[PDB]
Amino acid sequence: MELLDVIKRPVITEKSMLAMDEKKYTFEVDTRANKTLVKQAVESAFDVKVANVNILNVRPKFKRMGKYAGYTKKRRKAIVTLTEDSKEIQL
Amino acid sequence: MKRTYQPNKRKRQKVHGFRKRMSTKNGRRVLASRRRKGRKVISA
Amino acid sequence: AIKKYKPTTNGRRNMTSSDFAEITTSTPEKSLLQPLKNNAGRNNNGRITVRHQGGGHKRQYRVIDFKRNKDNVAAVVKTIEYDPNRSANIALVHYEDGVKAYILAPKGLEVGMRLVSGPEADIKVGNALPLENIPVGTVIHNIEMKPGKGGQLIRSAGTSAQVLGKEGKYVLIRLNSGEVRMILATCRATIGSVGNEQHELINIGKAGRSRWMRKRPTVRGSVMNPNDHPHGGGEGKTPIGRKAPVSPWGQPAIGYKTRNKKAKSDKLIVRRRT
RNA sequence: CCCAUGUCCAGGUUGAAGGUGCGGUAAAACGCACUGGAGGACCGAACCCACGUACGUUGAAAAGUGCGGGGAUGAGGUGUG
RNA sequence: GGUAUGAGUAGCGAAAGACAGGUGAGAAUCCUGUCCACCGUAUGACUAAGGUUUCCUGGGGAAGGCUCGUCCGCCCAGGGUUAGUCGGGACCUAAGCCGAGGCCGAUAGGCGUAGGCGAUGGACAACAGGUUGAUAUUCCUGUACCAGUUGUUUUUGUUUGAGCAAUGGAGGGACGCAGUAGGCUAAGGAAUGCAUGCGAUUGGAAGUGCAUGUCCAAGCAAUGAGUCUUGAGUAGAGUUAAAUGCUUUACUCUUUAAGGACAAGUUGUGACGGGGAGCGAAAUAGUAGCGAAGUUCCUGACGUCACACUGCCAAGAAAAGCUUCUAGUGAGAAAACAACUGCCCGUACCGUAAACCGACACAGGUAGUCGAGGAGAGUAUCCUAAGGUGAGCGAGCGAACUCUCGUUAAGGAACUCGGCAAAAUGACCCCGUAACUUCGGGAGAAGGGGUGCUGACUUCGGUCAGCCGCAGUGAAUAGGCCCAAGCGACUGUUUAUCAAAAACACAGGUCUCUGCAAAAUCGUAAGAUGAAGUAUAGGGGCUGACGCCUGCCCGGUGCUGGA
RNA sequence: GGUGAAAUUUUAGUACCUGUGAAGAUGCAGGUUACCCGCGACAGGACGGAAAGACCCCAUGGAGCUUUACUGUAGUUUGAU
Ligand SMILES: [K+]
Ligand SMILES: [K+]
Ligand SMILES: [K+]
Ligand SMILES: [K+]
Ligand SMILES: [K+]
Ligand SMILES: [K+]
Ligand SMILES: [K+]
Ligand SMILES: [K+]
Ligand SMILES: [K+]
Ligand SMILES: [K+]
Ligand SMILES: [K+]
Ligand SMILES: [K+]
Ligand SMILES: [K+]
Ligand SMILES: [K+]
Ligand SMILES: [K+]
Ligand SMILES: [K+]
Ligand SMILES: [K+]
Ligand SMILES: [K+]
Ligand SMILES: [K+]
Ligand SMILES: [K+]
Ligand SMILES: [K+]
Ligand SMILES: [K+]
Ligand SMILES: [K+]
Ligand SMILES: [K+]
Ligand SMILES: [K+]
Ligand SMILES: [K+]
Ligand SMILES: [K+]
Ligand SMILES: [K+]
Ligand SMILES: [K+]
Ligand SMILES: [K+]
Ligand SMILES: [K+]
Ligand SMILES: [K+]
Ligand SMILES: [K+]
Ligand SMILES: [K+]
Ligand SMILES: [K+]
Ligand SMILES: [K+]
Ligand SMILES: [K+]
Ligand SMILES: [K+]
Ligand SMILES: [Mg+2]
Ligand SMILES: [Mg+2]
Ligand SMILES: [Mg+2]
Ligand SMILES: [Mg+2]
Ligand SMILES: [Mg+2]
Ligand SMILES: [Mg+2]
Ligand SMILES: [Mg+2]
Ligand SMILES: [Mg+2]
Ligand SMILES: [Mg+2]
Ligand SMILES: [Mg+2]
Ligand SMILES: [Mg+2]
Ligand SMILES: [Mg+2]
Ligand SMILES: [Mg+2]
Ligand SMILES: [Mg+2]
Ligand SMILES: [Mg+2]
Ligand SMILES: [Mg+2]
Ligand SMILES: [Mg+2]
Ligand SMILES: [Mg+2]
Ligand SMILES: [Mg+2]
Ligand SMILES: [Mg+2]
Ligand SMILES: [Mg+2]
Ligand SMILES: [Mg+2]
Ligand SMILES: [Mg+2]
Ligand SMILES: [Mg+2]
Ligand SMILES: [Mg+2]
Ligand SMILES: [Mg+2]
Ligand SMILES: [Mg+2]
Ligand SMILES: [Mg+2]
Ligand SMILES: [Mg+2]
Ligand SMILES: [Mg+2]
Ligand SMILES: [Mg+2]
Ligand SMILES: [Mg+2]
Ligand SMILES: [Mg+2]
Ligand SMILES: [Mg+2]
Ligand SMILES: [Mg+2]
Ligand SMILES: [Mg+2]
Ligand SMILES: [Mg+2]
Ligand SMILES: [Mg+2]
Ligand SMILES: [Mg+2]
Ligand SMILES: [Mg+2]
Ligand SMILES: [Mg+2]
Ligand SMILES: [Mg+2]
Ligand SMILES: [Mg+2]
Ligand SMILES: [Mg+2]
Ligand SMILES: [Mg+2]
Ligand SMILES: [Mg+2]
Fold first, then answer.
1. Smallest Cα–C1' distance to nucleotide D42: which residue has it?
2. Has the keyword Ribosomal protein been applied to this entry (chain B)?
3. How many angstroms separate the CA atoms of A54 and A24, rounded?
């Protein structure tokens, strides 16, 4: 897959916003991307230097509307920690 | 009082899973029957 | 020797066991050990084919040199060892060239004896020779039925056989059962009788000990139901109530011979017994 | 029922064989102490079982609970595959 | 399918709550507080499975909740699971499974070799604290370790070649049960050891008073209770080819040692750090923040050294990792330091359960770990600690009857099919203990005595003396006994869910088959079990410990032999 | 006060005695007794509820079992080829 397709979007939440204060950035990533790919994708997309990437899988969540019930899509969340002496991401 | 169903993820797949069904000719007959009937879930 | 346990318990009452005096070590030769799983009488279909087998203690197989075809060098007896897989004891022998083997321990074998095999070996206990080289009247064991195949007959504790004569390419042998037959003269045998003669005198003593030795209980046919056994059914205790007692599969159990009536070996069996 | 591989059995009790010493003897058998720690051994929780009885009997439960009961290092219990 | 009747009846599922204040349209039922009560070898703390969002936060009160509801494991809306080191994969094999060719077979297929798959086992590198509403050995802080990469410096090797190194030779990994000694350390207890805070009105106490707390990794360095082990050399044979490795045969010397291999733990450093009784802020909580002491003595682990030792018979995985050896491969290697690289999956939450299996927020069932104190042998028992809980209908009344429980005059089995049920016995110490016996037993037979408190005195178990009560294992929890007969020797096993027995099994006995491609059994067969066993073995029938015994009949029927 | 089933049920304004009757009637006959509606209790009756009697017999029903029932047959064995 292309590097520009690995990173889907940022994650903006109370937890991710807090983590930005520590210079780590949460993204939704392609479910098939390993944390090394994410590191490479982040660096090429933002010119930053990445110190560490932590990565989790998010299970699909049960939801219902009216008479219909199903599941939200599975997601893959990558927390990218930038090095010191490095540019930050500005989303 | 121990009841008959003692759930076990692995044993469910090993006994009833898709690959167990596919590995025998009569297992494939089951999958053919489930598909013919139109079951949303053909294997366990 | 056989030691008799005092009746400290009803289970211990009347029980006896060997004192294992002849056993010189309990450290088996690692190189010669192989794994055996307990089949518990079940075959490759997973069915019980032989009843009353299963459970009991775990065992490691000791590879026994039944062929005794290493003739170049002599082997010095190092130990007499317990073997869970057979009624006889086994002897660890070191060949002068460093090859290690187990043999069945003959009666009178002693640590330090130097054993030889081959046509020119002396007629001494523990030596293995082709039957053609063994004088008539000699007590032998571990008789191979086919040249190079390895000893098959006369291997259990205390057993022995005797050379009776030579006719043609065959040696006349009296087996332990009393049968007299011809064995191909190129077949080898070991001189002596098998040791641990006292094995037969052991009073097992309690049901649990038989379970240790991998024997599951026998149920008599008479106390089964008719769909389980020809002896099953009837009200109260019953007699056999048939022409003759039979096995679970209807085969007569008293006196009926089961040897194939067209056996090839019949030509080689001179006088039967058992 | 079996196979492979794990695992569990609070705490007490009794004191088999063997060994040692001193007696005994030609040597012994053998006697007495001590030591030794055997057992489908003993008492008893967990654990397993299910003997009596009451109760329950549109139940708390499609077989249980209460009070007692048996086994509890074994032919033992039990997990995983 | 709808709706009646029974009925406004049965039931509302094993238990403690009370009141104040609050919230709100509304509260026995939600929140807060206080006291009270319940579990505590647990009703606590973990974790595997299983579940699969039930976790957190903010709202909600239709339905679900056996009542209620402002509340909820429910509904709505948002959010939450972070690892080179944990568990799994990129490592290993067991049972078993699959199975190239192959063997077998109306078809279908069955079996099976090489080769694999497959843990419940083997192997394998980090820890303590902090942090969030919800994750943390995963984030952060500190300090590590394992594999590898690039570069710098330092040494030494360039084919009389260091080094690397087999899929090959080896070694190793590597294993049972029981029994106690011993060492260490959790842990526990005590103290007029230390630290901090207090002097308490209900009569008394400023001291021998009260309450509380009383120490910390991995790594690294050094040591270490101890544990196991003889160590050489000469000459030979071997190790499909080689070897300096390894196996081994002889022979010399050694062996209370020697050398070697292991080792719980300890001390120091990690740590000027972190925790820590308690004190305790603002701009509105007990939260920032700050922060004392860390001693002695007693007990002391089947937790660990360690299956180390001893004994036993029933005799107790494999493979890889690993370590060696050459064969081969080699031009470069290694050390130090610096910088840097390290993937996938799981990681929320419940988990003796209202979130698992039981149709239920069901008195059942659910592997493993930790599981404190007093008295105690104890994880029993009673009450408690840390911690958790008051259990999803209530308020009255205090009838019959039913259930569960307590006490009963005199009698004491008269009850009844039957002492069913209940009562009584019950712990520890001491005295004592029959027939019979297979000499072990029977026995805890039986039958008796003692048990509290306070001084004196002790050979440390008592003794003497005194004292109080109806009663001293003052509560709780720990045999009723004896005589005799039948049956079964015994411990065991069985009709899950009306039978636990005299039934089955059993050790022992006997008969018989079976000479090994054994008999026997599964299978059309191949292929298996029997057995990697071999007549002291294996199959089958019957009997059923042990003791004494087991008589007569072979005409019949079977079997065996004859022919 | 709250919540709220069930088995059963042809419609029921559903007494007693003696009698009658498919021979044991709340319901028929004759006589006797009895104001209307409940509540707490007890079980004699409603041949009470539950289960299309299991005993018994029957059906040219079924199934399991036995054998010197009949007819076959796997297996075993003997001969020919
Ligand atoms: K479906
Ligand atoms: K016995
Ligand atoms: K043996
Ligand atoms: K039997
Ligand atoms: K019978
Ligand atoms: K009961
Ligand atoms: K109804
Ligand atoms: K009604
Ligand atoms: K709410
Ligand atoms: K991992
Ligand atoms: K494992
Ligand atoms: K090397
Ligand atoms: K470590
Ligand atoms: K340290
Ligand atoms: K987690
Ligand atoms: K104590
Ligand atoms: K306790
Ligand atoms: K409530
Ligand atoms: K009342
Ligand atoms: K009553
Ligand atoms: K009476
Ligand atoms: K007695
Ligand atoms: K007294
Ligand atoms: K007792
Ligand atoms: K019996
Ligand atoms: K018996
Ligand atoms: K008898
Ligand atoms: K019983
Ligand atoms: K039985
Ligand atoms: K007998
Ligand atoms: K027999
Ligand atoms: K018989
Ligand atoms: K027998
Ligand atoms: K006869
Ligand atoms: K006859
Ligand atoms: K009628
Ligand atoms: K009635
Ligand atoms: K039937
Ligand atoms: Mg992860
Ligand atoms: Mg048998
Ligand atoms: Mg029977
Ligand atoms: Mg039959
Ligand atoms: Mg019969
Ligand atoms: Mg009879
Ligand atoms: Mg016992
Ligand atoms: Mg007991
Ligand atoms: Mg259990
Ligand atoms: Mg049972
Ligand atoms: Mg008993
Ligand atoms: Mg009523
Ligand atoms: Mg309740
Ligand atoms: Mg309590
Ligand atoms: Mg308890
Ligand atoms: Mg919640
Ligand atoms: Mg909420
Ligand atoms: Mg409600
Ligand atoms: Mg692992
Ligand atoms: Mg196969
Ligand atoms: Mg093929
Ligand atoms: Mg293989
Ligand atoms: Mg590890
Ligand atoms: Mg949490
Ligand atoms: Mg005062
Ligand atoms: Mg060679
Ligand atoms: Mg210890
Ligand atoms: Mg968690
Ligand atoms: Mg429950
Ligand atoms: Mg009385
Ligand atoms: Mg009285
Ligand atoms: Mg009477
Ligand atoms: Mg009477
Ligand atoms: Mg009674
Ligand atoms: Mg008491
Ligand atoms: Mg019995
Ligand atoms: Mg019993
Ligand atoms: Mg039953
Ligand atoms: Mg019963
Ligand atoms: Mg019998
Ligand atoms: Mg009439
Ligand atoms: Mg009438
Ligand atoms: Mg009328
Ligand atoms: Mg009329
Ligand atoms: Mg009726
Ligand atoms: Mg009928």
1. C9
2. yes
3. 10
Q: What is the 3-state secondary structure (H, E, C) of A21-63?
A: HCCEEEEEECCCCCHHHHHHHHHHHHCCCEEEEEEEEECCCEE
Query: CA-CA distance, C260 to C269, in Å (whole number)?
Result: 13
- Separation of CA A45 and C1' E398 in angstroms? 84
Residue C116, token pair as written in the block: 């030889």
Pair C134, C163: CB distance under 8 Å: yes
Q: Is the CB of C21 under 7 A from strand E?
A: no
Distance (Å, rounded) from C-alpha A6 to C-alpha A50? Answer: 16
Strands C33-35 vs A75-82: parallel, antiparallel or unpaired:
unpaired
**Which residues lie at CB < 5 A from ion ligand 40?**
C 52
**CA-CA distance, C151 to C90, in Å (whole number)?**
14
Taking the CA of residue B41 and the C1' sugar atom of nucleotide E291, their distance in angstroms comes to 65
CA distances from B42 to B24, B35, C220 (A): 15, 7, 49
Do the beta carbons of residue C63 and residue C103 sit within 8 Å? no
* Touching chains, A (3+ CB pairs < 8 A): none
The domain locations on chain B are 1-44
Residue recorded with tokens 């780590």:
A24
Six-digit token string for C179: 């049968």
- Ligand 48 centroid–CA C250 distance in Å is 32
Q: Smallest Cα–Cα separation from C59: which of C84, C33, C23, C26?
A: C84
Buried b or exposed e, range C226-257, using 16+ CB within 10 angstroms: eeebbbbeeeeeeeeeeeebbeeeeeeeeeee
Q: Could you check: is the Cβ of residue C47 within 7 Å of any atom of nucleic acid strand D?
A: no
Helix H, strand E, coil C: the string for C249-274 is CCCECCCCCCCCCCCHHHHHEEECCC
Distance CA C183, CA C173 (A): 7
Closest nucleotide to residue C175 (Cα to C1')?
E515
Q: Token pair 């540019």 is at which residue? A: A87
